[PDB]
Symmetry: D2
């Protein structure tokens, strides 16, 4: 049977994503000096304020004012006309910082985590969330290179796709609806914005085979959007966890990723579960798969591993599990080495999705032996 | 045929849940005085600080000192020895409140989806993994408050792994495979005594005996020592336990936290409606297990689309169930608000022990279906 | 015989004065609704932040978003280019407000001293050094607001050194020795043009020509460049300009700031009373220059002691002046409050340009004395 | 003619003095690593919170959480029963920190400053403020060594003395009134507290010749005082400037001292003016004297220097000025060298008065040539 599915993505200037990106900029600053830094950094953004709160164990000396302001400048908030300015906003810091066989390190917390993959795209991700992210990334590219200099940092996209099912797999047929709202400078009209959104953004990102006569476009649906970001709005780290992962597809364990080092299995085991799911699909063992893992605080080994193939394998779920246990060691002290999780690359994961890119180690499938 | 599935839950004193409870206490304070209040309240808790941020349109005048402090008191943080004290903590108010529109005084949102889920494996009509996880935290609070284990403090986390088998799409719990409990405690009690009380007075008082066996794995105080807890040990924020609030990893989640958001946030009121629909189908005997997917389109009050996925557990087709749902439910967000009585101040009770599964809310009372 | 004496003053946009003005705006908001409000409001201003802290007992419901933002708007900080903007700054409210006593609803402090001072060297009855310093800041604000020098920003500081001679204890200003002016400015204007306008349109519009000569020293924009100012460049707090608020180093100060404190704080209302007494003696022709010292004892409403020090500028003994003061003034703090109308919301006007010397307040209106 | 004079002092646990002491602990932490650090650190204390705000130019890496908490522990707040606890209070940091002939350095700000001295005590200070400070210091000594273990950190004293005048000098005759309020543990009665205040504090500090039959004692005048410090109270740096100096005597320029390095003439020139006043009095050039100096931002030399002797010299005020100008160079870049103002000794100045101690360089008179 057929169904519609909708995923959302948000640009770097959305207040929740500002916080994710600042959190990871703080993490990256620690890791550049101290690869073994432990970081749990939560960020809050509201009118005129960034606040940092959390715990850090690190030998680094980090200038938080500079790291935060620079990230805000990088996002593109440099003037009160845009709603926020890195030069004059309030930065408050409440980070409590202590000084300090690695394969046996215990999980930093308990929790459950999922990975997912699907053969419907080359990236091995759901089409809805690939397209939603790609529309926001293209907005930011065109903003930053001056192709559309009226663009500002805050944006939200929603993409509805009509699917068919094929023996537990999902086959995207057409884009049903695209919604784009993007922040903009006072000096452009809506007719021009709408035309640019359709021609320079949607047509540059969405394969033409999914767009047809009945595709519904809602471009700047709420009209003008001059002020954005944290102004009259409050955001927090870890409030876009569905957007950061599979856009509604598969499942989620509840843990946020941004501002967390590798011992926080919320992030490292979700990355490893994605790596497992992608490896199974690119291995041709199934067409779509969900992987669950779980941990207890202070315990190095997973408490559970489970594999659900949606009926898209010739192997049983039990046989896939046995294969997974022969090819992967999901201790955090081992995941760190296989996925290089002490490298300061996290600020790049904080927008446009943690999954479906090529450059990240969890997106390179492992050759399986079975 | 068998598989494992794990869910977690956290106690009232976990720092993220403190924040959910405070944000909903704020919402209830506003609704008490102004049933049309619009609220989007975020809370941050860290060593000695409660910060309230967000936007409110309301006629209410709320005393945040009182609302925040009583909530913290009720949770049980009343001394520096416990890491946090309602008498001495810093309450910072950064909320932006405006009066409702002058001219309306004198006279349906995002393109998005919501999921509801229900399963006949428990009477709560919820996954056993998460029902048990919630009940373990609730039992710790009960024994802490009636003084049976006076060494307990408010911060707790639990995790339950169940071994299941499948039967024509339904899931049948066989036994509890693994239980984790970590709970904050006073300085005097010993690990042995804690691990013994958690097994004998908590777990065995909550988990049906038929699910426990000699191979069940217990990880009780697995870190070894948990004196530092609450916001002292970890920063809390509103809306960071969204899976604990819902189905424990089962079903699906389309995104959005609930607490500190009024009934006009559709990702809060339509999620409750989709639960209501899923629970009504299962209690109506129409299927054993169901995922209800409700899509809304920018503007249109009527849902864009509804899909019902019964996993094979129904004698009727997915198109027949969809027809039943349409004949019995009106899922326009304004109709939902009236049918589920969502203008009333009951939200603080939702903010610990899960939004779904308790027999305390209108969305947990099934609708008798005609067909 | 001659000597130098220096005093300073600061503009409305100096970060410490922003805080004094906000704290008094808070007090006035409360008094407007509840004339018995008790207020002790502290303000901190730093890059992008206004923080309100302190204690209030009041029946008022005040909108701090509005009160703080309008005050900042009025000061002139309305864009990030100026370093601070009322539209986008973070207002954090940490004030602790309680209702007045339940049971009194249905039905004189520290051992300390206060000083008043007055001198006949100006009509304001204040030292010339500080009268001139205040007027230079006021003139900058006037020319900034009417657009004569649109390159001016709100943050300014001035300092005036006067050469004096003495005559039987009175002080006689001879000339202005040195003037300092530092004022925040836009990016485009050049130092030469600023230094020329400050001399020609500010100083020469304010200082009587008889005090200026070819040897007068001008330090105008002495740091060279002052684009970064307001709370961006320096943290402000309430009650850090207490000498600018009073006599500019002349007379004496027994300790205490004024702004954000209601009339029941005796170090605020008895300082105004002692000014009133000192000014009344000088305008009554009883002396040319006077320091009035009023001591209060823990509990006793009546002053413990009053000493009058006339520096030799009076035909009457210091004991005769004391007798006159006692026959004409009742310095019990409750009587002071009634006589000077201190329950009214006029405090925000006190918080820039000095509490003493302007003909705008009851304590600056002399009492006609009988003797 | 005779008159009464009253001075106040407050203990380390008074909320305003907590902030002064934290500000100077932050300054001292910078100076221990970077002698040329520029610091303007303001502290705010209220229920459950210390906030730091200001500007720093320094090469130091300072852990602010540790510096603040430790200072709070040092003051003696370790439990919510006392109203405040270093282990669980909120510490928020908003310090903006940049990296960077010294005799020519310009004043860090404009301002006026006074120094004062008087021959009425050996310390060359007014008796009222010497006694007020000494009562608070003795309370803290007895608290910290366990002589009176019921004592807590917050305290306030007021001392009224009856004076005579002698040719512009002031002669203290008797103590008229002593007020002491001190914070205390629940477990002591007021009768015992009052007796200890009189016998172990007042009699150990006030010379017996000033105490007589009519001396009024107000000991714990407002009754019980269990909770103190910042709880239901707000304090700020630089709100006790009269207490920190001459207790009402002489004059004040308005600048606070705590949290400021030597380029902030509010502090360095006030120290130097005190040094000048003390040198004149110990030199026998007068019995009592007030010194004024003033500065402009970015200008190294004083704009004005003035000397008022109260009629207590045989020399004219003009002759004293000429002597001062021959023996002292009041440029901040020179004052720093003469008074050793890069040394991290400032936390010790933050309670019990900056003046009248023996160990500080501004309290050692210079031998004058004239």
């Amino acid at each position: 049977g057929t169904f519609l599915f909708t995923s959302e993505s948000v640009g770097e200037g959305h207040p929740d994503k500002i916080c994710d990106q600042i959190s990871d900029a703080v993490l990256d600053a620690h890791l550049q000096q101290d690869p073994d830094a432990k970081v749990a950094c939560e960020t809050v953004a509201k009118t005129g304020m960034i606040l940092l709160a959390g715990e850090i164990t690190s030998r680094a000396a980090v200038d938080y004012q500079k790291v935060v302001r620079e990230a805000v400048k990088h996002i593109g908030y440099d003037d009160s006309s845009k709603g926020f300015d890195y030069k004059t906003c309030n930065v408050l810091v409440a980070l409590e910082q202590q000084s300090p066989n690695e394969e046996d390190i215990g999980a930093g917390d308990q929790g459950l985590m999922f990975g997912y993959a699907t053969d419907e795209t080359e990236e091995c991700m759901p089409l809805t969330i690939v397209l939603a992210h790609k529309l926001n990334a293209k907005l930011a590219e065109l903003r930053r290179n001056g192709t559309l200099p009226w663009l500002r940092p805050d944006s939200k996209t929603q993409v509805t796709v009509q699917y068919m099912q094929d023996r537990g797999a999902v086959l995207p047929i057409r884009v049903h609806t695209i919604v784009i709202s993007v922040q903009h400078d006072e000096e452009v009209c809506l007719d021009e914005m709408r035309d640019a959104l359709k021609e320079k953004v949607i047509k540059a990102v969405v394969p033409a085979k999914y767009l047809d006569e009945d595709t519904i476009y809602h471009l700047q649906p709420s009209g003008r959007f001059v002020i954005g970001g944290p102004q009259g709005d409050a955001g927090l780290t870890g409030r876009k966890i569905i957007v950061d992962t599979y856009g509604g597809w598969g499942a989620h364990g509840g843990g946020a990723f941004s501002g967390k080092d590798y011992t926080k299995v919320d992030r490292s085991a979700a990355y490893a579960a994605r790596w497992v799911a992608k490896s199974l699909v690119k291995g041709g063992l199934c067409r779509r798969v969900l992987v669950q893992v779980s941990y207890a605080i202070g315990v190095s080994h997973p408490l559970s591993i489970s594999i659900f193939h949606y009926g898209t394998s010739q192997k049983s779920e039990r046989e896939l599990l046995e294969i997974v246990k022969k090819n992967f060691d999901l201790r955090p002290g081992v995941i760190v080495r296989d996925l290089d999780l002490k490298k300061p690359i996290y600020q790049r994961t904080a927008a446009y999705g943690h999954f479906g890119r090529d450059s990240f180690p969890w997106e390179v499938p492992k050759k399986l032996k079975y």
